[PDB]
Amino acid sequence: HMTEYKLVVVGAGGVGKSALTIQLIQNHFVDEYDSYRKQVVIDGETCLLDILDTMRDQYMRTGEGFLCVFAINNTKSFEDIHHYREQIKRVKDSEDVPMVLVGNKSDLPSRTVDTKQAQDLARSYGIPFIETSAKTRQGVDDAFYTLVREIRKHKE
Ligand SMILES: Nc1nc2c(ncn2[C@@H]2O[C@H](COP(=O)(O)OP(=O)(O)O)[C@@H](O)[C@H]2O)c(=O)[nH]1
Ligand SMILES: [Mg+2]
């Protein structure tokens, strides 16, 4: 019928995991803030996205792809990515897990993490880096779509 993709958004508090997710589902930005579902067509395949915004360690073990989110104006969040990724490495017992690195809040002027740093990090892990803003919606569809396509590159 349709095809199910189980996605997991991880990252430090306050980076905009919820805002990103709410943006994908409901097409608005919320300033103050479980599992979600969205039917989308991506490359002519109707997809049901089963999305957790982080006793829900059963999404960690079963989840097929991970958005690793930091904010570009939060250097601590960027440094923490190493830990979120090591957590996903341990749970899946492998260094080849579908993953996208996301740099959120690209609208904000107070940028403490440079695109080169992010690119250096993503290149080391062997994954895409995408800049997003949940406020303007820049990059949001592209982060989720690319993660869907990363999952396709790894098994049917
Ligand atoms: N300006 C701006 N603010 C954002 C963005 N994404 C999230 N925020 C704000 O950052 C705060 C934390 O967002 P939230 O979605 O709760 O992040 P989470 O804790 O990782 O789920 C909220 O006040 C959001 O409005 C963004 O892209 N741009
Ligand atoms: Mg949240």
From Swiss-Prot:
One of its GO terms (cellular component) is focal adhesion. The modification N-acetylmethionine is found at residue 2. Its main location: membrane. The keyword Hydrolase applies. SMART domains: RAB, RAN, RAS, RHO. The keyword GTP-binding applies. The modification N6-acetyllysine is found at residue 92. It comes from Homo sapiens. GO terms for molecular function: G protein activity; GDP binding; GMP binding; GTP binding; GTPase activity; identical protein binding; LRR domain binding; protein-containing complex binding. It is a lipid-anchor. GTP binds at residues 11-19, 104-107. GO terms for biological process: actin cytoskeleton organization; cardiac muscle cell proliferation; cytokine-mediated signaling pathway; epithelial tube branching involved in lung morphogenesis; female pregnancy; forebrain astrocyte development; gene expression; glial cell proliferation. Changing residue 134 to T: In OES; somatic mutation; also found in colorectal cancer samples. Changing residue 13 to C: In lung carcinoma; somatic mutation; also found in metastatic colorectal cancer. Its EC number is 3.6.5.2. Transmembrane segments: none annotated. This is GTPase KRas. Alternates between an inactive form bound to GDP and an active form bound to GTP. Activated by a guanine nucleotide-exchange factor (GEF) and inactivated by a GTPase-activating protein (GAP). Interaction with SOS1 promotes exchange of bound GDP to GTP. Belongs to the small GTPase superfamily. Ras family. It holds the Pfam family Ras. Ras proteins bind GDP/GTP and possess intrinsic GTPase activity. Plays an important role in the regulation of cell proliferation. Plays a role in promoting oncogenic events by inducing transcriptional silencing of tumor suppressor genes (TSGs) in colorectal cancer (CRC) cells in a ZNF304-dependent manner. The lineage of its organism: Eukaryota, Metazoa, Chordata, Craniata, Vertebrata. It is linked to Leukemia, acute myelogenous: A subtype of acute leukemia, a cancer of the white blood cells. AML is a malignant disease of bone marrow characterized by maturational arrest of hematopoietic precursors at an early stage of development. Clonal expansion of myeloid blasts occurs in bone marrow, blood, and other tissue. Myelogenous leukemias develop from changes in cells that normally produce neutrophils, basophils, eosinophils and monocytes. Keywords: Acetylation, Cardiomyopathy, Cell membrane, Cytoplasm, Deafness, Disease variant, Ectodermal dysplasia, Glycoprotein, GTP-binding, Hydrolase, Intellectual disability, Isopeptide bond, Lipoprotein, Membrane, Methylation, Nucleotide-binding, Palmitate, Prenylation, Proto-oncogene, Ubl conjugation. Acetylation at Lys-92 prevents interaction with guanine nucleotide exchange factors (GEFs). The modification N-acetylthreonine is found at residue 3. Changing residue 13 to A: In colorectal cancer samples; somatic mutation.
